DNA sequence: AACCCGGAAGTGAG
DNA sequence: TCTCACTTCCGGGT
């Protein structure tokens, strides 16, 4: 199961708002509220130990080059999706 | 600190 | 066996 899909799933469920949430969902900008908590949930999702935010965020950086995600410059823990799930699956 | 960066190479899963 | 999508490590930067 893919990082971008898992991120969209958490964003779609207000139960996870203490981990991650939309900042401006019209612009698809999201905030990682608890980067360590988020990495822990992701490692759990993939059934593997020793996942960290340093490691998860590296995986997010690969998405920059794939034009799936951009960092919001100078705004800590703020990112945006450049694509919808439909668009990513194309 | 706590986060952000992208190259290089390693690896679970299917 | 082979590919994919990360994972792991790194040396930096902010």
Curated annotation (Swiss-Prot):
Q: Which residue ranges hold the DNA-binding region?
A: 1-82
Q: Where in the cell is it found?
A: Nucleus
Q: Which residues form a coiled coil?
A: none
The covalently linked position for Glycyl lysine isopeptide (Lys-Gly) (interchain with G-Cter in SUMO2), per the record, is: 65, 83
Top-rank lineage group of the source organism? Eukaryota
Q: What does this protein do?
A: Transcriptional repressor; binds to the DNA sequence 5'-CCGGAAGT-3'. Plays a role in hematopoiesis and malignant transformation.
What protein family does this chain belong to?
Belongs to the ETS family.
Q: How does it assemble?
A: Can form homodimers or heterodimers with TEL2 or FLI1. Interacts with L3MBTL1 and HDAC9.
Name of the protein described by the UniProt record? Transcription factor ETV6
Organism, per UniProt?
Answer: Mus musculus
**What gene is this protein translated from?**
Etv6
